[PDB]
Design a protein around this nucleic acid. Structure first.
Ligand SMILES: Nc1nc2c(ncn2[C@@H]2O[C@H](COP(=O)(O)OP(=O)(O)OP(=O)(O)O)[C@@H](O)[C@H]2O)c(=O)[nH]1
Length: 1095
DNA sequence: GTCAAAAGAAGCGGAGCTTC
């Protein structure tokens, strides 16, 4: 244990004694950190890191010498060297800001003088940086090595942090702001997706600084310093960046939106470099110079990414051997730049791509104020996607004379839900624009004959890209439908692309030609299709046409179908057989494809089935209130408003109701995953308001282009035939808005009752400022909930089966009950340990527990089985990062601001997280994992969770393997996996040791409403073990069903499009049988197996 | 309560209570 001397040699002049038992000033940097066994950072021991690395970055030969490599990244040329010289000089500036801030901190309130006299200011929340200072005269100064290395990390973060930030949805913004997800004002989500919160900016910064420091944490040192000192350094660098205008600080006030919300939230945005910046072509030069094993970098040629050991943001969960092999298989896949599409993007230009694929140039007075904010977010996405692709291209272009032959590899990690995800925000897997420029798919096709199987594959790839629903029709019908389109509407776009692949130029009206020809088919993959087809037409050798065009083996209602197959526990019903067929499980029909099923057997998928069930449930709700005219008129209004703006809702001339699969897509998926009805209603209202705000922009665009046009024609002219027909549509809109915002349905004793809000919408509409806010959004939501959503939920249940709902409820309850105990015991063991440390003189409050002490508490929970094992997958549902455990500030900056909460990796309440965890995990997660590791695993693909892009040459076998992987996935039993660990939890849990806050939470899940309030510990313990019993019976049932189903002749085409189903070769033939006959025969085998286990 | 990642600022004082 001579490591005390080791780090003292490196940092001898730091203020303080390197022992916690000393009485003077104690140096907590040398107590918290040690030198690593093997070198991590090349700046360790350097007198002046900024000078040393600047010298390294000054030339290619010096960079090669510093990194001890023979050859350096060829993108690091003359222009890039010039820009790094300038960024290095900027590092000197940030370092200079940091020094003046320290000086100011030492002077204010005579802290410097007090600290020199013995005051332990280095243990304050805002003074932990005094652990890295040195004595200089009658004052203090930074340790230059530590300061400059931190600045270097700050510079790398400044360059690439934005391309690594997480995408924030509406739910995320809701959690930050404290405003209900449904009631969020327009554009606010866009504001918070562009910015970084305090914790977001600091944690990413502190991660960099600490790694750049290149030291190991001391397991026996308090978290308040091990995690606190680099966080303190991060907070100061951020404050320095605010001063230099590299980062813009925005304190957003919530009382401007929701007056009784008192949150003021800091939002931080990194100033973007101009996209033509030479540094964009190689932004990881510092990272690759400082670190022996750099995180951030592109992987070219045969430089393959390492395989991550632990689950993403779950350090307690190790990736299984099978998961690691999958991650290796995907990281081995070579990606290639498709030059034609890059050239196409480049020729169109950023502006015209924004025009074509976004909203283009915004006229902020021909646009509704709320509608403009949606369009700003649509442009931001496309523009950032465009810049980020061309930053990659520029680096790729430098690797070789031909870009199309440079192999690119991508890093992957396994998430909490067992999904293989490409790291970085804008990659082929996450960005559609990038997806069409960098492909792993490629094939040499014989297209000299339009009767080749190669040309059939080519047609399938074009049709799917052009928005033809290829899984709904056979290949032959697909072929004819593609021809009609190519020779019809697309012809002028094809002609324009033919000329582009001849002269290399586009016409001035390019956006117009593409927009008119594609219409609703407009997507990036559709632009690929026009490109690849026109390239084929001009091709010199059609016998050997090289193309990255792909076919996606796409899961048909993947989530819901997986849940139905994996978690239904009862006896087989005839409805289940018909409904599961909608997802590709065909019983007693050898070689049946999804194509044949949709065209000859059943054209309704699971979304449509639930939509038709919603229609039936609406008719049953109307009967219950047949004489109640106000209620009948209220349903009529909601449906009138939806029909008016949404394509999926249609009302006939005689009042006939027609609903399309569209409105059920998102609700069906999230309902099963445990989403509440109110969240669904909010989203439905949000898509209604979106279309209304958009229509207001259309009004202004008509009013300015014709000041004589009526308000009715301006809003409904594109829909109606005459003036009076438009006026009655305007009459509908104003009527519907009034009654739906002034009256709401409330459920009293199981009976719906209408109530006045007293906040109804009325007044002359101003199409510019028109906004539906606060009480009015809540009103529409209430009507949507009781008249549309609740009927749909009943329809969803009817479709997927009550047996599945029961299972998911049991799964949710079990995992919730377990997570509450884990969270509470952890918190209590933390408080137990913090009580002990108070009786310690060397310890002080503000310091936390040591990592070793936190490992002791985590390991003490092993008997409660926090992990769920499948044999090939591991899940930790409770696992989270949260500030509730420490409940204290970790560090502040030197202005007493930027107060970073101490986040601890600890268990938390699961909520309904258990359901998507297991469904996605053992469903699509397990499928893709299998698809990467199986015997004869499809190569050169791009996996996107429930869909796989395959090269045109291998569409047949890859699709069959995919369906085989689905079948393998359906051998899983997630409920058994949950039961296995919940049973261990039930044998070791003491419910009495739980807090009354935690005890009530378990009561919510375990007991019926009437029994909660104040039940005994023995009462909730009995109910918890009842759920254990329930789990066993479900798991028993799922196991039997799977075994029984395996004995029967099956054709599986869930990953549909190509028409290549997997056959299980079950010996028991069930052909020429009705679902009713099939159910009876399957149940005969069920009880046969059930009595075999019995004895 | 879908999930795939969390997440208020700041004066006075040196923690954590407090007000916007
Ligand atoms: N867990 C989870 N997965 C999602 C969610 N949204 C999308 N996904 C998955 O992420 C994948 C993204 O697919 P993309 O190819 O990027 O396109 P898309 O998201 O389907 O966008 P659209 O085509 O407009 O519907 C999908 O295959 C989904 O399975 C979500 O909200 N939660």
């Amino acid at each position: 244990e001579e490591l005390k001397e080791g780090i003292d040699a490196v940092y001898p002049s730091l203020v303080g004694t390197a022992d916690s038992k000393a009485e003077g000033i104690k140096n907590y940097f040398k107590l918290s950190f040690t030198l690593p066994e093997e070198q991590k950072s090349r700046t360790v021991g350097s007198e002046a890191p900024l000078k040393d690395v600047a010298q390294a970055l000054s030339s290619r030969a010096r960079y090669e010498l510093f990194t001890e490599k023979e050859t350096a990244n060829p993108a690091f040329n003359g222009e890039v060297i010039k820009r790094y010289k300038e960024l290095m000089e900027h590092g000197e500036g940030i370092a200079d800001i940091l020094r003046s801030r320290l000086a100011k901190f030492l002077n204010t309130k005579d802290v410097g003088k007090r600290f020199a006299q013995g005051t332990e200011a280095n243990r304050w929340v805002g003074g932990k940086l005094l652990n890295i200072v040195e004595q200089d005269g009658d004052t203090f100064k930074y340790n230059e090595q530590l300061l400059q290395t931190a600045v270097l990390a700050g510079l790398q973060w400044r360059l690439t942090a934005t391309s690594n930030t997480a995408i924030k949805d509406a739910k995320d913004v809701a959690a930050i702001t404290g405003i209900d997800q449904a009631l969020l004002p327009e554009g606010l989500v866009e504001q918070f997706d562009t910015g970084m919160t305090l914790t977001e900016a600091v944690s990413s910064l502190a991660q960099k600084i600490e790694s750049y420091w290149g030291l190991s944490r001391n397991p026996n040192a308090p978290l308040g310093y091990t995690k606190g000192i680099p966080t303190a350094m991060a907070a100061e660098i951020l404050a320095a960046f605010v001063e230099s205008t590299d980062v813009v600080e925005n304190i957003v006030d919530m009382s401007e939106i929701d007056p009784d919300n008192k949150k003021t939230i800091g939002l931080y945005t990194i100033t973007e470099l101009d996209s033509f910046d030479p540094i964009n072509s190689f932004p990881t030069a510092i990272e690759e110079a400082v670190l022996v094993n750099p995180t951030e970098k592109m992987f070219f040629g045969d430089d393959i990414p390492p395989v991550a050991n632990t689950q993403l943001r779950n350090p307690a969960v190790r990736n299984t051997p099978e998961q690691k092999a999958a991650l290796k298989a995907e990281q081995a896949t070579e990606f290639y730049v498709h030059t034609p599409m890059v050239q196409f993007y480049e020729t169109l230009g950023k502006d015209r791509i924004l025009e074509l694929m976004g909203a283009g140039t915004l006229n902020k007075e021909l646009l509704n104020d709320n509608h403009a904010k949606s369009l700003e977010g649509k442009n931001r996405s496309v523009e950032d996607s465009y810049n980020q692709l061309f930053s990659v291209i520029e680096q790729v272009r430098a690797q070789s004379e031909d870009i199309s032959t440079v192999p690119i590899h991508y890093a992957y990690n396994m998430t909490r839900v067992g999904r293989m995800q490409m790291l970085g925000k804008y990659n082929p897997q996450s960005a559609k624009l990038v997806r069409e420029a960098i492909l792993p798919t490629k094939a040499t096709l014989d297209l000299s004959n339009q009767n080749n199987e190669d040309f059939s594959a080519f047609q399938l790839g074009l049709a799917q890209a052009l928005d033809i629903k290829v899984h709904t029709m056979t290949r032959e019908v697909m072929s004819d439908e593609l021809t009609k389109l190519l020779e019809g509407n697309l012809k002028p776009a094809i002609d324009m692309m033919v000329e582009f692949n001849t002269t290399g130029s586009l016409p001035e009206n390019a956006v117009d030609v593409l927009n008119t020809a594609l219409g609703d088919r407009k997507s990036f993959v559709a632009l690929m299709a026009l490109m690849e087809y026109s390239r084929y037409l001009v091709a010199e050798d059609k016998s050997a046409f090289v193309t990255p065009l792909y076919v996606e083996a796409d899961g048909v209602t993947n989530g819901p179908i997986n849940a139905m197959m994996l978690m239904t526990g009862g006896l087989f019903t005839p409805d289940w057989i018909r409904n599961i067929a909608k997802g590709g499980l065909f019983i007693g029909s050898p070689n049946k494809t999804m194509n044949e099923h949709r065209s000859t057997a059943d054209n309704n998928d699971l979304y449509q089935a639930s939509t038709n069930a919603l229609m039936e449930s609406l008719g049953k709700l109307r009967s219950n209130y047949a004489s109640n005219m106000p209620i009948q008129s209220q349903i009529d209004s909601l449906l009138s408003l939806m029909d008016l703006f949404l394509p999926d809702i249609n009302l006939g001339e005689n009042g006939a109701l027609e609903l399309k699969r569209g409105i059920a897509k998102n609700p069906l998926t999230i309902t099963i995953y445990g989403s509440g009805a109110r969240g669904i209603a909010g989203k439905l209202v949000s898509s209604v308001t979106d279309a209304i705000y958009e229509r207001m922009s259309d009004v202004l665009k008509a009013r300015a282009k014709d000041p004589n046009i009526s308000a009715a024609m301006a809003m409904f002219g594109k829909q109606a035939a005459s003036e009076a027909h438009a006026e009655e549509l305007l009459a509908r809109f104003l009527k519907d808005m009034e009654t739906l915002t002034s009256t709401v349905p409330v459920k009293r004793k199981g009976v719906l009752e209408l109530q006045s809000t007293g906040t109804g919408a009325k007044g002359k509409i101003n199409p510019k400022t028109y906004t539906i806010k606060g009480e009015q959004l809540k009103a529409l939501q209430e009507n949507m909930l009781h008249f549309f959503v609740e009927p749909l939920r009943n329809g969803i249940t009817q479709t997927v089966g009550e047996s599945l709902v029961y299972s998911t409820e049991q799964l949710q309850k079990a995992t919730q009950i377990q997570s509450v105990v884990l969270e509470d015991m952890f918190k209590q063991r933390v408080q137990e340990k913090l009580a002990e440390k108070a009786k310690d003189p060397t310890w002080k409050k503000g310091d936390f527990l040591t990592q070793k002490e936190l490992n002791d508490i985590q390991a003490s929970l092993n008997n409660l089985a926090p992990m769920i094992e499948t044999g090939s997958q591991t899940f930790y549902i409770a696992g989270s990062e949260n500030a509730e455990v420490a409940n204290q500030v970790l560090a502040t900056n030197l202005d007493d601001r930027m107060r970073v909460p101490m986040s601890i990796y600890a268990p938390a309440q699961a909520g309904v997280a258990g359901i998507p965890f297991m469904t996605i995990g053992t469903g699509d997660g397990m499928m893709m994992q299998t698809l990467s590791t199986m015997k004869g695993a499809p190569k050169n693909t791009l996996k996107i969770f429930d869909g796989m892009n395959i090269g045109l040459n291998d569409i047949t076998d890859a699709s069959r393997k995919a369906n085989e992987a689905v079948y393998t996935s359906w051998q899983g039993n997630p409920i058994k996996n949950v039961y296995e660990s919940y049973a261990k939890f039930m044998k070791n849990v003491d419910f009495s040791k739980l807090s009354p806050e935690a005890l009530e939470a378990i009561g919510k899940s375990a007991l019926e409403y009437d029994q909660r309030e104040n039940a005994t510990v023995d009462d909730i313990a009995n109910a918890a073990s009842l759920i254990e019993r329930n789990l066993r019976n479900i798991a028993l049932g799922v196991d039997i069903r799977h075994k029984v189903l395996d004995k029967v002749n099956l054709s599986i085409d869930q990953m549909a499009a190509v028409g290549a189903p997997y056959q299980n070769n079950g010996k028991i033939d069930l052909s020429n049988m009705t679902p009713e006959q099939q159910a009876d025969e399957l149940n005969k085998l069920f009880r046969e197996e059930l009595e075999a286990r019995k004895q």
